């Protein structure tokens with residue numbers, strides 16, 4: 210029993226974190242094989258700024274060891290520093306781009322030293338509600354599938370509302386953001402409907418049923434209601450994905466949608482669900498199945 | 507900016523997790539140097555659990571009855587001893603991944619990271635607090651016994667909790683790494699229940715200071731309170747008494763934000779009376795009590811917004 214915001218074990222990623230210094234700027238890098246990946250802003254016309262730099266301008270520290278930079282290249286908003294030593298702690302890994310609504314673990318780092326791990330979701334507006342201070346750039350987001358680490362996010366900046374923006378490990382930003390100090394703002398955000406539904410199924414599994422009712426709804430009527438409360442539309446793909454949890458609890462997805470509709474229209478009435486007075490949207494259907502089954506890495 | 511429930515990086519603890527099997531029971535162990543620490547109830551059957559005589563059950567066991575597996579390697583048990591509710595299995599190999607560590611016993615209100623494990627394999631990490639009633643609101647399934655709670659103090663791992671059981675309300679009970687239980691619990695399947703729980707007042711105050719540091723002040727008021735009047739109101743909402751030690755501990759956050767502890771106490775009294783009126787504080791519609799004053803200082807900026 211119990212339901213916590215759970216992150217993946219971070220050990221395989223901790224063994225990849227390094228410190229990258231160029232001039233006065235210090236940030237974090239990800240050392241995989243013989244390459245260190247980091248935000249290109251560590252050096253704007255980035256090609257013009259990069260051409261002036263030489264390998265010895267980049268100081269890379271792995272623990273108490275200075276790595277030697279033997280080459281450098283830029284891929285989108287990510288700088289790739291070729292080093293003379295392959296990371297002996299390189300795990301089995303992939304670079305994956307995630308979609309809004311998907312969750313991942315963030316290993317927050319400062320000066321190449323991991324300080325904390327938390328779980329979060331890529332918001333529908335492509336920002337993440339992270340917890341980052343100055344020095345956190347280059348911190349990474351990841352998931353683990355069996356023994357393979359899938360790197361999905363690299364931290365680049367904080368927006369004026371306190372939310373965060375970054376790229377995949379190929380340097381493509383999530384959202385309409387640029388890596389420059391200029392007027393940028395997070396767009397209006399929405400609630401991840403399929404995730405709220407997964408979390409309501411997790412509450413039922415844990416013995417919380419007060420919000421269940423005898424009613425059902427059509428997908429179209431639910432989406433008309435959901436659009437009124439700034440909730441993302443629920444697709445047939447989401448309904449299919451929630452199939453296993455529906456079969457386990459005996460509550461059809463559209464039956465749970467009628468519970469969600471009543472919660473949006475009437476509120477919680479002083480009650481909580483899994484210790485929360487708000488509808489939680491940062492657990493995917495897969496996270497609920499994993500945490501209520503005990504999958505190991 | 508931002509405020510998340512943050513756990514310590516778990517790598518130093520992952521390299522210590524092993525699987526311990528004795529007969530039909532399998533659970534997790536913590537391998538440090540040449541010793542594997544695990545709950546002593548690994549020697550029990552489900553029947554034994556009502557009134558087990560651990561000393562009588564242990565004397566009947568030999569070293570080769572305990573199977574210890576570290577990854578895909580079988581460790582050889584060369585000795586065994588019981589210390590309170592933990593079993594200590596001496597092995598023939600020191601753990602090469604043993605970090606710098608200490609065994610610390612924590613007090614209610616203290617927070618720590620839990621590395622939940624099954625079959626000696628880590629599955630997840632979460633942050634939690636030792637409740638005033640000595641239970642933890644964890645997320646544990648069968649096979650999670652032996653999973654540990656810890657903090658990482660610079661580069662040193664302080665082990666503070668080892669998981670032993672789940673109470674009927676779904677909450678969890680365990681011991682420190684010397685085998686002493688937190689709370690009036692026993693490693694017996696007898697009728698046991700968590701006592702009435704309360705809110706960790708000093709932690710809610712720390713979290714209100716974190717909200718001010720992050721730029722939110724909607725909940726402050728022009729009032730102050732005496733410590734005694736605050737405690738009289740707090741007890742009525744099932745909040746733990748606030749002591750002079752708690753007021754002293756909140757000193758640094760009071761100096762950083764410019765808000766006196768008893769003024770922040772007056773703001774808490776008003777929140778308990780009015781609720782939030784559709785507003786949130788750091789993304790929460792409830793008053794959060796699982797961040798200590800130390801966690802707030804560690805996570806938040808040193809410059810108030």
Ligand SMILES: CNC(=O)CN1C[C@@H](C(=O)Nc2cncc3cccc(C)c23)c2cc(Cl)ccc2C1=O
Pocket residue numbers: 250341342343344345346365366367368387388389390391507
């Ligand atoms: C809030 N930031 C600023 O005022 C200045 N700023 C610096 C930098 C940036 O966001 N850094 C930071 C990153 N993460 C958390 C941060 C918390 C607090 C402070 C800072 C600086 C943080 C940045 C990088 C890029 Cl790629 C693009 C633009 C910028 C930028 O505008």
Ligand SMILES: CNC(=O)CN1C[C@@H](C(=O)Nc2cncc3cccc(C)c23)c2cc(Cl)ccc2C1=O
Pocket residue numbers: 210547555646647648649650651670671672673692693694695
């Ligand atoms: C819920 N418990 C039971 O039905 C049986 N039970 C077994 C065992 C125990 O709590 N295990 C478990 C531990 N943690 C999470 C658990 C989730 C789900 C299921 C089980 C078994 C879990 C235990 C150990 C001690 Cl030292 C004392 C008493 C017991 C005990 O009563």
Ligand SMILES: [Cl-]
Pocket residue numbers: 611612613616
């Ligand atoms: Cl303590």
